[PDB]
């Protein structure tokens, strides 16, 4: 590419392209180099978006806030605040029955499948993020298919970004990258403060213990195959 | 600077002079920085030993607990005052000092200001200005500055600037003698100790004791010293 030099300069004019590892030269997929920078950019943007979502979720789940809906399934089940009564926002994921985590993960998987599809991306006008195209672009959920009409698209559902200034959109992309890096640092600080108490200067005595694995989605209560055999040996 | 005092000359017994220009610039920068740090440390040590404890430490100033500033000040000299602050306080003070040092070493900011090669090379001792354009663009306008925040040095001739730099170098050498002599006088030693001067730390170079993660070091008892 070599355009990422100028993008790194626009993100921060003091520190430009900062890569001690020189990972832009690393052709990890053995495609063109353009594909490698495209994959790295898309991975950074997706990581950042997930991190801001998880940061706001952690902040609003760590202090006694829960929806007054039910999540029962029929005359019994979780009251939607019993998960809040399991501890901080890492035992709550390990308390969402069995099917709730499955449906959440499958929704994210179908969303990523919609992201990756070149027929869907090509119908919007872009391509795959490594075969040229625009990194971080989510295609329209309306134009690509979905035979029953849906109300809104994922990006800008209410329409409050239309006819915006293109330079304002570029500034928003740069701010998204910077806030994504900052939110990744924040959410990993919180996740470290879950398990490790002695880390960081701040956040001392404000975080739930969570005697468990942050990186294990399925918990010991799941009745999926293996799982219990997969949780027979903890680690550090 | 050839020789500020004509009766001394070029006192270089170790032969570090007549070296590469980058080495000479680094040596001059280290001399100026050590002298300035020694002068500031001597002034702070004198103020702390006299007793200048501030009316502060209110509204959860210690991390939910409220320990008074005089309680930290009621430990002895400055050496005991540097061992009574919390780990976050010393860590954040060191981080602020490191941020200032890294901003001073920044070649982009120095070249924007109109300077020479960084790591305090050409024109050593020049702190870059944290204002105007292409610096600190993300909020934080920095209404104050590092050198002359009130603009007391607004106008100065180049000859006057050179004379003030030579005077600062001589005072920095005197302060590098003096602050080390004061620390030695705290640790017994020296000539005419007197003046109570409290007690001294293990070496003064321990930095941050009673921390977590890497501070499990019982090695500060020996190594001769």
């Amino acid at each position: 590419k070599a355009e990422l030099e100028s993008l790194a300069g626009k993100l921060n004019p003091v520190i430009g392209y900062w890569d001690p590892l020189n990972l832009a030269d690393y052709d990890q997929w053995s495609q063109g180099q353009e594909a490698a920078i495209g994959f790295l950019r898309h991975a950074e943007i997706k990581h950042g978006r997930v991190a801001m979502a998880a940061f706001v979720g952690y902040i609003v789940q760590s202090n006694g806030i829960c929806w007054p809906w039910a999540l029962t399934g029929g005359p019994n089940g979780v009251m939607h605040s019993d998960i809040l009564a399991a501890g901080g926002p890492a035992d709550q994921w390990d308390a969402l029955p069995t099917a709730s985590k499955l449906q959440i993960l499958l929704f994210v998987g179908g969303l990523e499948l919609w992201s990756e599809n070149s027929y869907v991306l090509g119908l919007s006008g872009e391509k795959h993020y490594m075969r040229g195209g625009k990194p971080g672009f989510f295609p329209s959920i309306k134009k690509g298919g979905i035979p029953h009409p849906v109300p809104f698209d994922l990006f800008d559902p209410f329409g409050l970004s239309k006819n915006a200034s293109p330079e304002k959109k570029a500034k928003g992309l740069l701010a998204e990258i910077n806030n994504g890096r900052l939110a990744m640092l924040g959410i990993m600080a919180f996740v470290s403060e879950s398990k490790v108490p002695g880390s960081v200067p701040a956040l001392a005595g404000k975080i739930a213990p969570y005697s468990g694995e942050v990186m294990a989605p399925f918990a010991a209560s799941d009745n999926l195959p293996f799982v219990a055999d997969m949780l027979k040996s903890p680690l550090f | 600077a050839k020789k500020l005092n004509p009766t001394v000359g070029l006192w270089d017994p170790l032969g570090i002079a007549e070296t590469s220009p980058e080495t000479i610039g680094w040596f001059r920068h280290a001399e100026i920085k050590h002298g300035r740090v020694a002068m500031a440390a001597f002034v702070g040590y004198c103020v702390q030993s006299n007793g200048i404890h501030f009316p502060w430490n209110i509204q959860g100033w210690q991390g939910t607990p409220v320990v008074s500033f005089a309680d930290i000040a009621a430990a002895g000299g400055p050496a005991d005052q540097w061992d009574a602050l919390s780990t976050p306080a010393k860590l954040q003070i060191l981080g602020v000092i490191g941020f200032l040092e890294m901003w001073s070493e920044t070649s982009v900011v120095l070249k924007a200001d109109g300077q020479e090669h960084y790591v305090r090379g050409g024109k050593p001792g020049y702190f870059p200005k944290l204002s105007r354009s292409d610096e600190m663009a993300f909020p934080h306008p920095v209404p104050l500055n590092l050198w002359d925040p009130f603009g007391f040095t607004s106008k100065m001739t180049p000859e006057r600037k050179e004379k003030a730099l030579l005077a600062e170098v001589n005072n920095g050498r005197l302060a590098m003698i003096g602050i080390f002599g004061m620390i030695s006088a705290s640790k017994g030693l020296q000539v005419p100790g007197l003046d109570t001067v409290g007690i001294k730390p293990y070496a003064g170079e321990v930095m941050a004791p009673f921390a977590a993660g890497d501070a499990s070091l019982p090695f500060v008892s020996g190594m001769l010293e």
């Binding site: 590892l21 020189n22 052709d27 997969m230 040996s233 680690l235 550090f236 | -």
Partner: protein, 228 residues
């Protein structure tokens, strides 16, 4: 051209001593392999010995002081303070096997003609630069960063700077070989090196046997440890 380069490198290593070959190994055809290949092998082996000795000296300091990584790994079996000869005595046997295997993989990569000819180089006996390591650029699956310069901050060095770096490398290598075998000799016979008397404890096991006093057979791998 061979002996002339050898004289020049010896003169740059030390102007006073110069070329010192009392044994005359630079005139012996080692495998009936001319003069160029013999001096290339000798320089490559000297450079390799010096690099391994420098790394061994630093590692000996690190283990004698006690500088463990942390948890879970092979450092968890080694007792807290056993002196550097005994830290290659308590790591598991498979850890020693895999370490020696990775070193052999590195040697084989440094010698494989596909790796050398990838970045335009030939064998040191066949006419290449002694001590050079080809980067990684033939190893089927891509490698993230090279071994000589992992972060590539030496790519702006002048050839004169590289030559002075090689001379410093050889001198430091010789002096580190001498220091490291000072340590190993004091760990075996007392009173050899007078400075190191009483610092390094005596060791009974053989240094030249890798699996002598072999370590235990423990499985430090958790999660899905089907190899119990």
């Amino acid at each position: 051209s061979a002996k002339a380069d050898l004289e020049a490198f010896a003169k740059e290593c030390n102007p006073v001593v110069g070329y010192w070959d009392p044994l005359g190994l630079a005139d012996l055809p080692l495998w009936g392999q001319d003069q160029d290949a013999v001096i290339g092998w000798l320089r490559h082996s000297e450079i390799k010995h010096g690099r391994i000795a420098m790394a061994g000296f630093v590692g000996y300091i690190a283990h004698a002081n006690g500088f463990r990584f942390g948890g879970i790994g092979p450092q968890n079996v080694v007792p807290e303070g056993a002196s550097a000869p005994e830290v290659w005595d308590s790591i598991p046997f498979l850890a020693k096997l895999q370490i020696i295997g990775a070193i052999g993989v590195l040697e084989h990569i440094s010698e494989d003609k596909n790796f050398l000819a990838a970045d335009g180089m030939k064998h040191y006996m066949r006419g290449g630069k002694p001590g050079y390591f080809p980067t990684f650029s033939a190893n089927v699956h891509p490698m993230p960063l090279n071994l000589f310069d992992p972060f590539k901050w030496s790519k702006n060095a002048s050839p004169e700077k590289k030559a002075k770096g090689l001379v410093t490398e050889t001198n430091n290598g010789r002096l580190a070989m001498l220091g490291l075998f000072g340590f190993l000799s004091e760990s075996k016979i007392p009173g050899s090196v007078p400075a190191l008397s009483g610092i390094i404890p005596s060791y009974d096991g053989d240094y030249m046997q890798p699996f002598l006093p072999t370590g235990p057979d423990t499985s430090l791998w958790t999660i899905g440890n089907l190899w119990a």
